[PDB]
Amino acid sequence: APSLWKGLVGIGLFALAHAAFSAAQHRSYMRLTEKEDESLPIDIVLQTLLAFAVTCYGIVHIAGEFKDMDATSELKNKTFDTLRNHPSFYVFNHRGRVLFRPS
Amino acid sequence: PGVKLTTQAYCKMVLHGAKYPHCAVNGLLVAEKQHHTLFVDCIPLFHGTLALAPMLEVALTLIDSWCKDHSYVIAGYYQANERVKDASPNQVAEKVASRIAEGFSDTALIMVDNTKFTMDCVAPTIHVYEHHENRWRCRDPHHDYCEDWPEAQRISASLLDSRSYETLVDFDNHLDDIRNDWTNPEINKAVLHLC
């Protein structure tokens, strides 16, 4: 799922860049002709707004963690069996050691 | 009085010890009450700190609830120490032995050794202590407590070689996982199939 969102964001960014290039070409043509104070066509403006909204949707979905405020639910499935043993004090005197000695 | 146990109980005890080779293990043997003492099967009680009675309270009460359902009786209680160089019963073990001896007239304490605990077991590797309410604490030097030593050796070797002893469940796992039972059905099917 995240890969699809990343691809959609990339496609939206590419569409935005293409709309930018089209607007730049429009302004370059406008500089050619005297007067004719007209705005850029509305179709490209709608396309760039569509690219603005599409990339704005996946940018929220990419980084969603929203971890729970309560910390009692994170030590909830953990049992006391694993907590009893500690990495610090570790005695290497067990029957399994001499059981596994020969293979 | 001779002591005799079924290879199923011994295999269960050995596999319970193998499941947690780093902490002390506990077990309860079950007999039939209707001179030699015949054992039917064993149920593993707890593991870890192994110094708590009120959990043993619930364990033993549920054990009794099960014995009055299938017409069984509790014979003895077995415990293995953590350190390899330790073959002496503890105070809690003696207390449980006296508690069981109040009801039943024959409770043997089984100490599982750690020095001779390897892949290819010789045979007995079991310490039998006979305790009572008085200061009588005697350990039997050596006798025969199992029926078919070669066959039992073969089943034990097959069970230990094949990594199928992770299905063994404990009473603590029953509390943590209600899904898991504590009668060891798969173990019973396996020992029946092997024979």
By C-alpha distance, which of A79, A84, A87, A78 is closest to B172? A79
The shortest C-alpha distance from A69 to chain B (Å) reads 25
To test the contact with chain A by mutation, choose from B13, B50, B114 the residue with the greatest count of A C-beta atoms within 10 A, namely B114
- Output the six-digit token pair for A32: 């050619």
- Is residue A64 within 8 A of residue A28, CB to CB? The reply is no
**Sheet with B108-112, edge to edge strand ranges:** B2-5, B36-48, B24-31, B73-80, B108-112, B126-131, B137-139
**Helix (H) and strand (E) counts in chain A:** 4, 0
- Output the six-digit token pair for B33: 């009450």
Evaluated on CA atoms B90, B92, B93, B94, the torsion sign reads positive
Residue with token string 């930018």: A20
Residue with token string 């009450």: B33
* H/E run at residue B108: strand B108-112
Cα separation of A99 and B23, whole Å? 15
A95 vs B117: CB contact, 8 Å cut-off?
yes
| CA triple B77-B80-B85, angle to 5 deg | 145
Question: Resolution of the coordinates in A?
Answer: 3.5
B21 vs A102: CB contact, 8 Å cut-off?
no
Method of determination used here: cryo-EM
Alpha helices by DSSP H, listed for chain B, are 7-19, 53-67, 91-103, 149-161, 171-176, 185-194
